[PDB]
Amino acid sequence: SGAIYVGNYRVVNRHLATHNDWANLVWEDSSRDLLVSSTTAQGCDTIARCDCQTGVYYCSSRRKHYPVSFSKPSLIFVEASEYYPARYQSHLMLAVGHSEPGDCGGILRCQHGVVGIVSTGGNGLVGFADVRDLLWLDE
Ligand SMILES: CSc1ccccc1N1C[C@@H](C(N)=O)CCC1=O
Ligand SMILES: [Zn+2]
């Protein structure tokens, strides 16, 4: 689990969105595994606006943060699960690291701010949904 809070927005993994997230829907993209809902309270997370390929992510299944190198956002094939059939997921970044289903929502951060959230895993890899292109999150 985990979310990003910036301004009057809440960014969550689309497969983990609640009834309240859907009742206050701003934007959702199944191909990205992202959903953004509106909030009454003001969030103060800083979104990164950069092309970094190094950062640190939080891994709940180890209660630890790990430094990782990660690929640029791209269209990557993701094995079927109970939330989605086998498909290509867009705007995804991969790194060598540990990730279990419950790790979804862990934040990846660089020196500039939040880069994305854990969205895929298995085989010794960890995949992050990028949010750096969603410039509207800051306005
Ligand atoms: C670390 S997430 C993971 C790990 C192992 C096996 C499956 C997953 N996924 C991948 C997710 C997706 N974005 O398609 C769907 C939900 C899920 O549990
Ligand atoms: Zn950066």
UniProtKB/Swiss-Prot annotation:
Determine the domain of life of the protein's source: Viruses
Q: Where does Zn(2+) 1 bind?
A: 50, 52, 110, 112
For this protein, what reaction is catalysed? Selective cleavage of Tyr-|-Gly bond in the picornavirus polyprotein
**Residues the record marks as active site:** 15, 33, 104
The annotated subunit structure for this chain is: Homodimer.
UniProt function note? Cysteine protease that cleaves viral polyprotein and specific host proteins. It is responsible for the autocatalytic cleavage between the P1 and P2 regions, which is the first cleavage occurring in the polyprotein. Also cleaves the host translation initiation factor EIF4G1, in order to shut down the capped cellular mRNA translation. Inhibits the host nucleus-cytoplasm protein and RNA trafficking by cleaving host members of the nuclear pores. Counteracts stress granule formation probably by antagonizing its assembly or promoting its dissassembly.
- Per its record, how is this protein called by name? Protease 2A
Can you name the source organism?
Answer: Coxsackievirus A16 (strain G-10)
